[PDB]
Design a protein around this ligand. Structure first.
Ligand SMILES: Nc1ncnc2c1ncn2[C@@H]1O[C@H](COP(=O)(O)[C@H](Cl)P(=O)(O)O)[C@@H](O)[C@H]1O
Ligand SMILES: [Mg+2]
Length: 265
């Protein structure tokens, strides 16, 4: 086994953070000094090598805006140890008590961080395939990091998935760019489900017919125009994450220098 392995007694699971049919997520301590997130797999509910799939990708990716793998216990019972993100999922964050104070400058900076993490994914010729607010983690000082690479690979919820990927299995970094556009609407609506009042079948039907979500209330048209670029029918016409990162970093000087705060954004 490799250098990622740790002894089981160096890990202490303290507070349970979440649940599932396939495992648990705990806040804990590693080597008695390091605060960590610990992911477990429940015996014989899923294949051990299917559970380890996410860890294998995380071994190859290292970037300040991706959740970092720390250690692994690779024989059953399996544990996955990652950096601890104190504020939980971006989706929960946006929906909860802290949502009501976030304004456009915070939300756009969070989008810029996510674009930076995805620009690294882009540079590395990887695809994520499940980019959405539920798979972003939030830390102190509004730090946002991309997580859940369980489906990530080298070169599905229809509301976040590009049509060519959902229909024809065409997953590329450009279908992740599509998903990022949907993530931007989650950020600017404080975590609302996209395409409100539409079930999956209408969504499929409508998007192929040319329907796109309108500009969210109090969202500048220029930011909605960025969403529409991410949602171009032709995947090759969508911007790069490199472009998206630069656009969002410079947004309040180059694109909306006359922004003024409103009631919600
Ligand atoms: N590195 C981390 N630091 C802090 N909290 C984390 C964390 N990873 C997950 N959590 C929390 O545990 C919850 C569920 O975890 P999860 O990884 O998203 C599902 Cl198992 P999933 O793989 O999607 O099926 C999240 O809502 C987070 O709230
Ligand atoms: Mg998740």
């Amino acid at each position: 086994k490799d250098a990622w392995e740790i002894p089981r007694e160096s890990l202490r699971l303290e507070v349970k953070l979440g649940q599932g049919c396939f495992g648990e997520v705990w806040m804990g301590t590693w080597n008695g000094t390091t605060r960590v997130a610990i992911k477990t797999l429940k015996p014989g509910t899923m294949s051990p090598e299917a559970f380890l799939q996410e860890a294998q990708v995380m071994k190859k990716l290292r970037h300040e805006k991706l959740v970092q793998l720390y250690a692994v216990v690779s024989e059953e019972p399996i544990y996955i140890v990652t950096e601890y993100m104190s504020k939980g999922s971006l989706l929960d964050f946006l929906k909860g008590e802290m949502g009501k104070y976030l304004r456009l400058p915070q939300l756009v900076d969070m989008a810029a961080q996510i674009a930076s993490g995805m620009a690294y994914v882009e540079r590395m010729n990887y695809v994520h395939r499940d980019l959405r607010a539920a798979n972003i983690l939030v830390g102190e000082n509004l730090v946002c990091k991309v997580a859940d690479f369980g489906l990530a690979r080298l070169i599905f919820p229809i509301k976040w998935t590009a049509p060519e990927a959902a229909l024809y299995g065409r997953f590329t970094i450009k279908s992740d760019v599509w998903s990022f556009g949907i993530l931007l609407t989650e950020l600017t609506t404080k975590g609302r489900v996209p395409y409100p009042g539409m079930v999956n079948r209408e969504v499929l039907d409508q998007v192929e017919r040319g329907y796109r979500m309108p500009c969210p209330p109090e969202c500048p048209e220029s930011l909605h125009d960025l969403m529409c670029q991410c949602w171009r029918k032709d995947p090759e016409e969508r911007p790069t994450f490199e472009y998206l990162q630069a656009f969002l970093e410079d947004y309040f000087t180059s694109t909306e220098p006359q922004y003024q705060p409103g009631e919600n954004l």
